[PDB]
């Protein structure tokens, strides 16, 4: 644990949180990891436990052991929770992908959203209702949901989520929304504008922000561009930067800090060895679970 909590410092600027991720393994693999989470971060996103493959492996058969643990740990330690994720083409069970009947897929989709959301009703700050639904060019990804149901799946998912838990902020999440003017950013903005105009309950846009070294300085503009979609809020949801330079990290923190709609930042992991791209040392804590230069830099910028 770092003496100075970047979450505390970020919240002091009117932000809701500066969080990270977790699940049973990383929360129990050693003493430092859960200690760091408790001391320096104010929000948690389940790394894999709430995804479709991990929650409904078989049609109508739910497995909530992992997700229960993450939610219980967060709730037991005053951490906000971002449910992740309800509808996604990746980490989706084969039984869902093979459905060809529209009404059947809608029934399945609504049951999945309802059961998962109902179980944690009232305990979730935000839900990534839809994840990665756009192609790089800004058009809609031809996932089973889009292919079988059509664009109406967007409305269906958000409306179902809203009716199940009106206390949660409903988000549409995606990656590569990292520079103003990028085709995917333009596509995200145009579609959300249309959906909001149609009355679809989209409260926020989540920008994953999985960056390479030197890409931190372009994020401010990306968030500004995303602000034009018209959602009440936006958030950096899965931050990690190859190399973890102080310049990159501080640029990204400032990007959120100076944008009124940005409620917070979730860093995708605590320490480097637990990163999905561990070889690029993209996190704030190192192999010994000790604060890296970037962590202290973020603290000093707040």
* Residue spans per domain, the chain: 2-302
Q: Residue 113: is it exposed, middle or buried by C-beta count within 10 angstroms (0-12/13-18/19+)?
A: buried
> How crowded is residue 283: how many other Cβ atoms within 10 Å of its Cβ?
26
Q: Can you say how many angstroms the Cα of residue 301 is from the centroid of all Cα atoms in its chain?
A: 24
239 in Cβ contact with 277 (< 8 Å) = no
300 Cβ contact partners less than 8 Å away, ≥ 6 residues apart: none
- Reading the block at residue 21, the tokens are 């991720």
Technique behind the model: X-ray
Cross-strand bridge partners of residue 169: 126
Q: Residue 224: is it exposed, middle or buried by C-beta count within 10 angstroms (0-12/13-18/19+)?
A: middle
Rounded Cα distance between 48 and 55, Å, is 10
81 in Cβ contact with 44 (< 8 Å) = yes
Report how far apart, in Å, the C-alpha atoms of 26 and of each of 1, 34, 269 are: 15, 8, 9
Rounded Cα distance between 167 and 121, Å, is 8
- Reading the block at residue 289, the tokens are 């679970």
Q: Which residue in 160, 257, 151 sits closest to 194, CA to CA?
A: 151
The single-letter DSSP state of residue 25 is H
Rounded Cα distance between 287 and 283, Å, is 10
Residue 204 phi/psi, 5° resolution? -150, 165
Q: Which residue in 236, 237, 240 sits closest to 283, CA to CA?
A: 240
Rounded Cα distance between 288 and 18, Å, is 21
**Helix or strand or coil: residue 261?**
coil
The CATH code belonging to domain 2-302 is 3.20.20.80
CA pseudo-torsion sign 171, 172, 176, 182:
negative
**Helix or strand or coil: residue 95?**
helix
252 in Cβ contact with 239 (< 8 Å) = yes
Check if 159 is active-site: no
179 in Cβ contact with 218 (< 8 Å) = yes
**Location of structure tokens 């989520």:** 161
Half-sphere exposure at residue 23, Cβ-oriented, CA atoms within 13 angstroms: 18
Q: Can you say how many angstroms the Cα of residue 272 is from the centroid of all Cα atoms in its chain?
A: 19
Q: Which of 47, 56, 233, 238 is catalytic?
A: 238
194 Cβ contact partners less than 8 Å away, ≥ 6 residues apart: none
Instruction: Give the CA radius of gyration of the chain.
Output: 18
**Helix or strand or coil: residue 45?**
strand
Q: Which of 47, 56, 132, 233 is catalytic?
A: 132
The counts of H helices and E strands in the chain are: 13, 9
> How crowded is residue 257: how many other Cβ atoms within 10 Å of its Cβ?
17
The single-letter DSSP state of residue 29 is S
Check if 233 is active-site: no
């Amino acid at each position: 644990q770092a003496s100075v909590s970047i979450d505390a410092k970020f919240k002091a600027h009117g932000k809701k949180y500066l969080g990270t991720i977790g699940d049973q393994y990383t929360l129990t693999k050693n003493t430092k990891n859960p200690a760091i989470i408790k001391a320096d971060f104010g929000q948690l996103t389940p790394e894999n436990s709430m995804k479709w493959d991990a929650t409904e492996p078989n049609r109508g058969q739910f497995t909530f052991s992992g997700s229960d643990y993450l939610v219980n740990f967060a709730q037991s330690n005053g951490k906000l929770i971002r449910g992740h994720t309800l509808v996604w083409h990746s980490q989706l069970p084969g039984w869902v992908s093979s459905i060809t009947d529209k009404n059947t897929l809608i029934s399945v989709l609504k049951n999945h959203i309802t059961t998962v959301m109902t179980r944690y009703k009232g305990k979730i700050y935000a839900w990534d209702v839809l994840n990665e639904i756009f192609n790089e060019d800004g058009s809609l990804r031809n996932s089973v949901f889009y292919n079988v149901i059509g664009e109406d799946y967007v409305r269906i998912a958000f409306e179902t989520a809203r009716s199940v838990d009106p206390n949660a902020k409903l988000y549409i999440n995606d990656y590569n929304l990292d520079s103003a003017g990028y085709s995917k950013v333009n596509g995200m903005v145009s579609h959300v504008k249309k959906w909001l105009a149609a009355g679809i309950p989209i409260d926020g846009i989540g920008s994953q922000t999985h960056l390479g070294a030197g890409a931190g300085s372009a994020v401010a503009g990306a968030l500004n561009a995303l602000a034009s979609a018209g959602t009440k809020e936006i958030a950096i949801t899965e931050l990690d930067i190859a190399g973890a330079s102080s310049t990159d990290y501080v640029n990204v923190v400032n990007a959120c800090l100076n944008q009124a709609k940005c409620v917070g930042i979730t860093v995708w992991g605590v320490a480097d060895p637990d990163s999905w791209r561990s070889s690029s040392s993209p996190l704030l804590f190192d192999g010994n679970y000790n604060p890296k230069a970037a962590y202290n830099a973020i603290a000093n910028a707040l």
